[PDB]
Ligand binder design. Structure first.
Ligand SMILES: [Ca+2]
Length: 459
């Protein structure tokens, strides 16, 4: 029994989901999937930006193995030989399907997909936004539209409703073949463009506004100035903090976008059920990184903060699997770089060298004692590399000279009962033991005596 695999890969989604205890998000379909599988409460990405995270997941290698830490370098523009998920699965007789945003750069492994539906550009459906963009074009400006939109339109008026349609159609086409399918939903990546009915699930005035406070004694480059959001029309670019109203509009759009994607997940799951595929298809729900919607008064991703590195991850084994677990959580420390070797083991394949490990054991036995650490990186240009570790309770981050490995700053954040911490405890005499333990874990992954970090990003 080799199962099929269906992966919902959601862009820019932190665990803002009912099943993860969100008191705000309305996510009935994803919550139902969690009642049918194992929910990982301590899952972490290897860099909190799209391109490195996704190529790391799709190759089972960490960003610091690939040397790619920014957004302008397709995997295959540097590393043509490392074996990826679609390559390995296609060679092993599976149909391989990419819908929506899977690799950040759609050219990567394009020929390794037997069925390929490109990620699509953003759509603004409100005539006012269409007119803004028209006035840009008749002004010579390439500039973004607004950061969100709430048009009173059918689901297929934005790209994720279309992705769901392609997934439903392709499941019908491939129903008697072994397949692995990635359905890459793009929201809630900016702009937060989703139909009105999903906005109408929320009142912007109900959202709590996060405190406009940076962590005390943070490293100076711990957080960005959220250039990504500043690029959208209507976002002031000259202020530390956004106002309450705009903050609420953005929080509202992120939530509306999540509920929109939740409905699209439901459509694909309904087709999987109607086609009789649930009996032999494992379903994975995952994200490329976390996100900030006003936390620390900041926005977007692009850090080693807990809120940016922690992601949802739900795995539901096919319904014919005798050992399947449903409706249980796992606190095992797991990584997105583990997904590829997990799939290798699940589908009985011989896989390539990997920087992760299979978590199939924990999918079947969620309380199995598991790993001591999960690690990530984040580059601040070519000269500075942040490297971070969590044990599930504390996060420890060193910002190093990327050549010499010297520490430029260090951070220690407690995360026992919150994804946020407002106090860097590094150097605090009360936390010497925690700092030493976390530093040892970090240094095992990131030695100081093996030379510079690899650097392979290109223009
Ligand atoms: Ca992303």
């Amino acid at each position: 029994s080799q199962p099929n695999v269906l992966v919902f890969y959601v862009d820019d989604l932190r665990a803002e989901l009912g099943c993860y205890g969100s008191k705000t998000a309305i996510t009935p379909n994803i919550d139902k999937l969690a009642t049918e599988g194992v929910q990982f409460n301590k899952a972490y990405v290897q860099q909190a930006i799209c391109a490195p995270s996704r190529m790391s997941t799709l190759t089972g290698l960490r960003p610091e193995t690939l040397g790619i830490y920014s957004i302008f370098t397709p995997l295959r523009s540097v590393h043509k030989d490392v074996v990826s998920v679609p390559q390995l699965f296609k060679e092993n007789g599976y149909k391989t399907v990419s819908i929506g945003k899977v690799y950040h750069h759609g050219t990567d492994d394009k020929n390794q997909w037997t069925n390929y539906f490109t990620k699509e550009p953003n759509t603004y459906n409100k005539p006012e936004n269409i007119a803004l963009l028209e006035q840009f074009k008749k002004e010579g400006k390439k500039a973004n539209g607004p950061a969100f939109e709430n048009a009173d339109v059918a689901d297929e008026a934005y790209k994720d409703g279309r992705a769901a349609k392609y997934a439903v159609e392709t499941l019908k086409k491939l129903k008697n073949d072994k397949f692995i399918m990635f359905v890459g939903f793009s929201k809630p990546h900016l702009p937060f463009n989703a139909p009105k009915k999903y906005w109408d699930l929320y009142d912007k005035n109900n959202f709590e506004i996060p405190e406009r406070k940076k962590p005390e004694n943070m490293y100076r480059l711990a957080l960005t100035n959220w250039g990504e959001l500043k690029g959208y029309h209507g976002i002031p670019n000259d202020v530390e903090y956004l106002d309450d109203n705009l903050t609420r509009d953005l929080i509202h759009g992120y939530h509306a976008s999540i509920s929109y994607v939740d409905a699209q997940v439901g459509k694909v799951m309904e087709a999987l059920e109607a086609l009789g595929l649930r009996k032999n298809t494992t379903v994975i729900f995952m994200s490329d990184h976390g996100y900030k919607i006003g936390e620390y008064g900041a926005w977007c991703k692009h850090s080693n903060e807990e809120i940016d590195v922690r992601v949802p991850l739900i795995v539901s084994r096919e319904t014919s699997y005798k050992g399947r677990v449903a409706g249980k959580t796992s606190d095992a420390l797991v990584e997105n770089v583990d997904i590829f070797p997990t799939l290798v083991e699940l589908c009985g394949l011989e896989g390539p060298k990997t920087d992760g490990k299979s978590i199939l054991q924990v999918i079947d036995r969620p309380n199995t004692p598991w790993d001591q650490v999960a690690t990530a990186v984040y580059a601040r240009g070519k000269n500075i590399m942040g490297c971070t570790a969590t044990d599930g309770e504390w996060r420890y981050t060193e910002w190093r000279d990327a050549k010499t490995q010297d520490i430029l700053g260090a951070e220690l954040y407690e995360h026992k009962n919150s994804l946020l911490s407002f106090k860097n405890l590094s150097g605090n005499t009360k936390y010497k033991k925690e700092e030493a333990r976390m530093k040892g874990l970090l240094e095992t992954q990131f030695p100081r005596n093996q030379g510079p970090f690899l650097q392979h990003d290109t223009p």
